[PDB]
Amino acid sequence: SNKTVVVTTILESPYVMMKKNHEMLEGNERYEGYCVDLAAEIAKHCGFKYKLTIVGDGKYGARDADTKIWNGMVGELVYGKADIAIAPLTITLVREEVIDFSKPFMSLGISIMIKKGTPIESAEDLSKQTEIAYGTLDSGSTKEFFRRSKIAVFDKMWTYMRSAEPSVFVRTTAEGVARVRKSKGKYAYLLESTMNEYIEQRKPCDTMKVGGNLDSKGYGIATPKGSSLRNAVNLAVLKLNEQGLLDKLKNKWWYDKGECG
Amino acid sequence: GSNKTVVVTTILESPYVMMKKNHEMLEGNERYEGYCVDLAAEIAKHCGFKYKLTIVGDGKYGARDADTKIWNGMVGELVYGKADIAIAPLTITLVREEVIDFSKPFMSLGISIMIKKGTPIESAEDLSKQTEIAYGTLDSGSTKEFFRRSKIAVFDKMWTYMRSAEPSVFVRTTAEGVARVRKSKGKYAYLLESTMNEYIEQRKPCDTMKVGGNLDSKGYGIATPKGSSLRNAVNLAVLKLNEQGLLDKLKNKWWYDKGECG
Ligand SMILES: CC1=CN2CCS(=O)(=O)N=C2C(c2ccc(OC3CCCCC3)cc2)=N1
Ligand SMILES: N[C@@H](CCC(=O)O)C(=O)O
Ligand SMILES: N[C@@H](CCC(=O)O)C(=O)O
Ligand SMILES: [Zn+2]
C-alpha cells in the first residue's frame, strides 16, 4: 500500500539549491537543481510520491573507523531514516557493501581547482612543493581516495594533507571553493570534476580546473538493502539516459547556467 | 553443490579478445589475449572461481528478434543457459538489463564517428546535412538500436537515411566497418563506440580518426543471468578493481602503451 518515499539529498550546487523565493514556498517546491529534476523523473517513472529532505548532518557518508557508525546520506539509508538518496553520491566499494546503487547517472573524476594564475598544472606539481596548501572535503569519497591510494604521488599528497596545519580539510564544497578564492593562490582544492566545472562557469569567474582527472567513476541513486524500489529505480536511470534526459539536465544546470561567457 | 568451472562467453573483438599468434600450440584459456582476457582472470581470482573462456557461437553481441522474441549473441548465451557470465565489451542497455544483470560499468564509452583522415565532417549534424558521404553502424548491437530508437531530430534523420540506404550501410563486424572507411576514399564514415574508435586511431596505417563529441554516454558491464550466485561478488570485484587502478592500467596496456601511431 503506497506510502510517500522519503528522499535524502544534500545542498550542493547545482544538484539541489534553495530557490531565490524559497521562504514563500513549501515542501518540494522550495528546491531546484539537477537532482530535484532527476527525483521528479525517477518518481514519475517508478510511480511514487516523495518528500525531499536535506541530510541532517550535511555529509555524504563515511564510516567511523572506531565505532563503525555511518554518517551522512549513507547513514540515513542504513539506519532507516530515509528510503532513497538522490544526490551526487559517488559509487564506491565500501558503500556498495552496505547500500545498493543504481547504474550511474553521471560520470566524474577527482580534479584540481586553483585560483586563476596559480602555478600548478597537476597533482604531481602539488606534491612537489609546499608553498601552496591543498585539501579535500571531509566525510566523502575524495578524502577516502587519498587515504587509500598506493600511487606514489597521491600517497605523498595524503601524507601531507593528513598532518597539515592548519587543517586543509573542509566541511562543505562551498567552504573549499571560498578558501581557494580568498587564498591569493596559496590554496588549491581537490574535488569532483562535476562540481569543479560548474564553479568554473560561475561569477566571479576566478577559478579553474587544471590537469587531468585522477580517477573515473560515477554517481548513483542509493537505496537501503532489501528496498522494493531497487529494480524500478535502476531501470528508470537507464531509461532516462537512453531518452537523452540526463544529457538534457546536465546541459540545463551546467552550460545553460554559464555566467563566464 | 560441488565447485564447477564457470563458462565465460566473450567475443573476438580487438583489443578485448584476440587469438594469440601461437594459439594452435596452446590450450584452453591460454589461446586468447586482450583486455577482457586479463579482466576475466582478475574477476575470477577476486571472486574465487575457475573458468573457461568461450567465443560466442554466432559472433554477435545480443539483440532480441522482433518476431520470434529470441535473443542472439552473448545475451542469448546467458538467457538460454549456455554460459554463466559474459566478460566482453557488452553495452549496458535498458532492454538487456530487463533480461540479464550487469555489474557496475568497467569502462566508459559513447557512440562516436570514425572518418578517413581529411573527410570534411566534424559532427553528427554534419553527416545528417549531406549525402555525398555514406555512413552506417554494426548491423546488430547497441549502436544500431540507439539510432532505431532515437527521438532526437539529428539522430532520427540519420536513422531514416541509414535504414533505407542501398547498398546496405550496415556491417557484420567492427573490422568490416573499419575496412570500409579505409577503402572508401573519404566517402564512408562509421558510427561505433568511442573505445573501439580510439583503439583503431592508434593502429597502422594511422589513416582514421575520431571526430566530434560522443553522441551519448554509457558503459560496458559484466553480465550474468538473473538469479546468478555470482552477481554480488562480480559487482564488488569491478568496484575494487577500479579503485585499485587496475582498469585504467589495462586500458593503457591494450590501447596506448603499444599504440603504433606515435
Ligand atoms: C552519464 C552516464 C550514463 N551511464 C548510464 C548507465 S551506465 O552504467 O552504462 N554508465 C553510464 C555512465 C558511466 C558513468 C560512470 C562510469 O564509471 C566507470 C568508468 C570506468 C572505470 C569504472 C567506472 C561508467 C559509465 N555515465
Ligand atoms: N560525491 C562525493 C562527495 C564529494 C567529494 O568527496 O569530493 C561523495 O559521494 O562522497
Ligand atoms: N558494445 C555494443 C556492440 C558495438 C556497437 O554496437 O557499436 C553492444 O554491446 O551491442
Ligand atoms: Zn521521463
Author numbering:
A (entry chain B): 412 to 527, 641 to 642, 653 to 795
B (entry chain A): 411 to 527, 641 to 642, 653 to 795
Provide text from the study.
Glutamate is the primary excitatory neurotransmitter throughout the central nervous system (CNS). Multiple lines of evidence support activation of the alpha-amino-3-hydroxy-5-methyl-4-isoxazole-propionic acid receptor (AMPA-R) as a promising strategy for the treatment of CNS disorders. As glutamate release in the brain is strictly regulated, AMPA-R potentiators (= AMPA-R positive allosteric modulators) which can promote physiological AMPA-R activation by glutamate have been considered as an alternative approach. Here, we report the pharmacological characteristics of a novel AMPA-R potentiator, TAK-653, which exhibits minimal agonistic properties.
Based on the structure and agonistic-effect relationship studies on this novel chemical series, we designed TAK-653, a dihydropyrazinothiadiazine 2,2-dioxide derivative with cyclohexyl group as bulky terminal substituents to induce steric repulsion at Ser750 in GluA2o; the structural bulkiness of cyclohexyl group is higher than that of the terminal phenyl group of TAK-137, suggesting that TAK-653 may exhibit a lower agonistic effect. TAK-653 bound to the intradimer interface formed by the ligand binding core. The 3D overlay analysis showed that the peripheral cyclohexyl rings of TAK-653 caused steric interference at Ser750 in the channel-closed state of GluA2o LBD (Toyofuku et al., in preparation). [3H]-TAK-653 bound to the intradimer interface formed by the ligand-binding core of AMPA-R subunits in a glutamate-dependent manner. This intradimer interface is known to undergo conformational changes upon glutamate binding. Co-crystallization studies suggested that TAK-653 exhibited glutamate-dependent structural interference at Ser750, located in the intradimer interface of GluA2o with larger steric repulsion in the absence of glutamate. Ser750 in GluA2o LBD corresponds to Ser743 in GluA1i LBD, thus the introduction of an S743A mutation into GluA1i was expected to reduce the steric interference with the peripheral cyclohexyl rings of TAK-653 and to facilitate the binding of TAK-653 to GluA1i especially when glutamate concentration is low. In fact, the maximum responses of TAK-653 in CHO cells expressing S743A GluA1i were higher than those in CHO cells expressing wild-type GluA1i in a Ca2+ influx assay at each concentration of glutamate tested. TAK-653 at 10 μM was highly selective against 97 targets (Ricerca, Taipei, Taiwan); TAK-653 only inhibited lipoxygenase 5-LO enzyme activity with an IC50 value of 5.9 μM. These observations further suggest that TAK-653 selectively binds to AMPA-R in a glutamate-dependent manner due to structural interference at Ser750 in GluA2o LBD (S743A in GluA1i LBD).
